Design an enzyme around this catalytic site. Structure first.
Site, short mmCIF file in Angstrom:
data_model
loop_
_atom_site.label_atom_id
_atom_site.label_comp_id
_atom_site.label_asym_id
_atom_site.label_seq_id
_atom_site.Cartn_x
_atom_site.Cartn_y
_atom_site.Cartn_z
N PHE A 15 0.82 -1.24 0.00
CA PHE A 15 0.00 0.00 0.00
C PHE A 15 0.85 1.29 0.00
CE2 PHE A 15 1.39 -0.97 4.18
CZ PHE A 15 1.75 0.26 4.69
N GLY A 16 2.13 1.23 0.34
CA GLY A 16 2.94 2.45 0.55
C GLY A 16 3.80 2.33 1.79
N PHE A 66 -2.51 8.15 12.40
CA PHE A 66 -2.97 7.34 13.54
C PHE A 66 -2.20 7.74 14.80
CE2 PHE A 66 -3.34 4.70 9.70
CZ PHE A 66 -4.58 4.09 9.80
N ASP A 84 -7.89 -9.53 7.46
CA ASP A 84 -6.44 -9.85 7.47
C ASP A 84 -5.93 -9.90 8.91
OD1 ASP A 84 -3.92 -10.55 6.48
OD2 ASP A 84 -3.39 -8.44 5.87
C1 LIG Z 1 -2.41 1.10 9.55
C2 LIG Z 1 -1.78 1.60 10.68
C3 LIG Z 1 -0.60 1.01 11.13
C4 LIG Z 1 0.14 1.54 12.31
C5 LIG Z 1 -0.47 2.46 13.21
C6 LIG Z 1 0.18 2.98 14.31
C7 LIG Z 1 1.47 2.55 14.50
O1 LIG Z 1 2.32 2.96 15.49
C8 LIG Z 1 3.51 2.30 15.26
C9 LIG Z 1 3.46 1.52 14.17
C10 LIG Z 1 2.13 1.67 13.63
C11 LIG Z 1 1.47 1.19 12.52
C12 LIG Z 1 -0.10 -0.07 10.41
C13 LIG Z 1 -0.75 -0.49 9.24
N1 LIG Z 1 -0.31 -1.57 8.53
C14 LIG Z 1 -0.74 -1.76 7.15
C15 LIG Z 1 0.19 -2.63 6.34
N2 LIG Z 1 0.44 -3.89 7.01
C16 LIG Z 1 1.17 -3.60 8.24
C17 LIG Z 1 0.37 -2.70 9.18
N3 LIG Z 1 -1.92 0.07 8.84
CL LIG Z 2 -6.53 -9.85 2.35
#
Ligand SMILES: c1cc(-c2ccc3occc3c2)cc(N2CCNCC2)n1
Ligand SMILES: [Cl-]
Ligand SMILES: [Cl-]
EC number: 2.7.11.23
Length: 330
Positions: free
Chosen positions: A23-24, A91, A140
């Protein structure tokens, strides 16, 4: 794409790369307005990633406008904006993931007491997503997508609503990470929130043994490993399944068996009883004589897991009923 020290919109100072994905990327940034650190998920500037992340933003915003003690096991989306043609999700900051937690045990697992604490937060999260007006399927769930709130503490939150959909807003047939993929998804069947409960059952066993319950190398191997533990899926399920014949073969008398290829334990003979070591001091006997790891404790855990791994998504335990199980009684 992004330098450390870089300043965005006289608001965010980018510090460092947290993570990379399909996704990035996710970066650590300082928010000068709130005066706090945040995690910024930066979506790639391609239509495909943008359109899916727009769904992620919509579902997180939907969850936010619901104020109940059940919602606080999901990572908080603070806000989003567009920058240099990238969707950017801000976030709260969280700590390291449950896979890193397992890696740090050298894949020998955490205690039944810590497993319980994770299970109870996760069941509460699933109860929240099942609120009728939400009806969100995560799609997931896995250790990497569950983060500690604080490296000193055992509080967790679910992240990555990148694959998530509401009930009856299904896009993809092929979803979930393979190790955590539900039988109904392997079988090509229309899926509902019960697929998250299947993933959860897989995750809780792994958190305690250190190893994935069903580590298939592909879909055929995945189903074979599930069948080794749980037996042949019931005929009523296989009869309604578009992809049944990817894995199984029906017989004159209306019975199903495995398709065999060139050379698994016979169906239902790799017992969860032995994987957990219920009567043999826990996984690899490494919990022999530890408190909170009695046969009685193990039997309650086994019962709950087998309810989470019901082949039938209709009778599979639901989040409220999982929270009332004896495993969670003091
Ligand atoms: C949305 C948010 C976060 C996220 C949020 C707060 C966080 O504070 C420290 C690491 C972190 C990751 C991680 C992801 N991820 C999407 C991709 N796969 C791996 C996890 N998506
Ligand atoms: Cl998936
Ligand atoms: Cl893993």
């Amino acid at each position: 794409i992004v330098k450390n020290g870089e300043k965005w919109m006289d608001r965010y100072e980018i510090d460092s790369l947290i993570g990379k994905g399909s996704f990035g990327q996710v970066v650590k940034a300082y928010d000068r307005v709130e005066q706090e650190w945040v995690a910024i998920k930066i979506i790639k500037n391609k239509k495909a990633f943008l359109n899916q992340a727009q769904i992620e933003v919509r579902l997180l915003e939907l969850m936010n406008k619901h104020d109940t003690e059940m919602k606080y096991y999901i990572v908080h989306l603070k806000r989003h904006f567009m920058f240099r043609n990238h969707l950017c999700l801000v976030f709260e900051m969280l700590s390291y993931n449950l896979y890193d937690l397992l890696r740090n045990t050298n894949f020998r697992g955490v205690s039944l007491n810590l497993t319980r604490k994770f299970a109870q937060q996760m069941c509460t999260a699933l109860l929240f997503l099942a609120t009728p007006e939400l009806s969100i399927i995560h799609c997931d769930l896995k250790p990497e997508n569950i983060l500690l709130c604080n490296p000193k503490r055992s509080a967790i939150k679910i992240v990555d609503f990148g694959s998530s959909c509401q009930l009856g807003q299904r896009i993809y047939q092929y979803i979930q990470s393979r190790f955590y993929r539900s039988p109904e998804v392997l079988l090509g069947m229309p899926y509902d929130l019960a697929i998250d409960m299947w993933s959860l059952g897989c995750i809780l066993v792994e958190m305690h043994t250190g190893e994935p319950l069903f580590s298939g190398a592909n879909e055929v191997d995945q189903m074979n490993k599930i069948v080794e533990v749980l037996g042949i899926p019931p005929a009523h399920i296989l009869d309604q399944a578009p992809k049944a014949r990817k894995f199984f073969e029906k017989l004159p008398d209306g019975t199903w068996n495995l398709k065999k290829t060139k050379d698994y334990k016979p169906p239902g003979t790799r017992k969860l009883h032995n994987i957990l070591g219920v009567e043999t001091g826990g996984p690899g006997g490494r919990r022999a004589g530890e408190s909170g790891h009695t046969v009685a404790d193990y039997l309650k855990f086994k019962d709950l897991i087998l309810r989470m791994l019901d082949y039938d998504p209709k009778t599979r335990i639901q989040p409220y009923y999982a929270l009332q199980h004896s495993f969670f009684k003091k």
